[PDB]
Amino acid sequence: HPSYSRVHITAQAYENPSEPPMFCMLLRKHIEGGFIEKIEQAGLDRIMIFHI
RNA sequence: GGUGCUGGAAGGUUAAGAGGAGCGCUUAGCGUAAGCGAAGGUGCGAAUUGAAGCCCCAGUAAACGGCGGCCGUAAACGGUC
């Protein structure tokens, strides 16, 4: 989000699953079915690295 | 992919020619009536064989030939026929 950007494990139900955009479709094409190797930070900056 | 060219019969379509089943027409004669009829002669000839070629399978574009549309996103990428 431009003001509310965050990364956390949510617990509430984010409803209205509308028709997915093309970034979500490419994520389901490329990422789904895989495993997560490690979650590490690029130094001390606000950069999150996900190893899939 | 289609058409040309080259190669390949696994499988169908295959002509003429071989092949002759069988079915008509005549009658020596059996028959009260209408029909049946051997041997010949004379027409129609069904099955079975019978190559190239065609359907088919591959390659070949300095062979013939062709190289598209809609909607987004900033040539390029994404969705669909």
Q: What are phi and psi of A51, to 5 degrees?
A: -95, 110
Region of A43 please: left (phi>0), alpha (psi -120 to 50) or beta. Answer: left
Q: Residues A39, A51: contact at Cβ < 8 Å?
A: yes
Q: Where are the alpha helices (DSSP H) in chain A?
A: 22-30
Which of A51, A15, A14, A49 minimizes the C-alpha distance to A31? Answer: A51
Say which residues have a Cβ less than 8 Å from residue A7's Cβ, sequence separation at least 6.
A48
CA of A22: nearest nucleotide by C1' is B78
Strand partners for A41 = A48
Question: In 10 A of CB A27, how many CB atoms?
Answer: 13
- With residue A29 as reference, give the H or E element that holds it: helix A22-30
Nucleotides of B strand lying within 7 Å of any protein CB atom? 78-79
Which nucleotide across the nucleic acid strands is nearest to A23, CA versus C1'?
Answer: B78
CA–C1' gap, A15 and B64, in angstroms:
61
User: With contact defined as beta carbons under 8 Å apart, do A40 and A50 qualify?
Assistant: no
Q: Give the SS3 label for residue A47.
A: coil
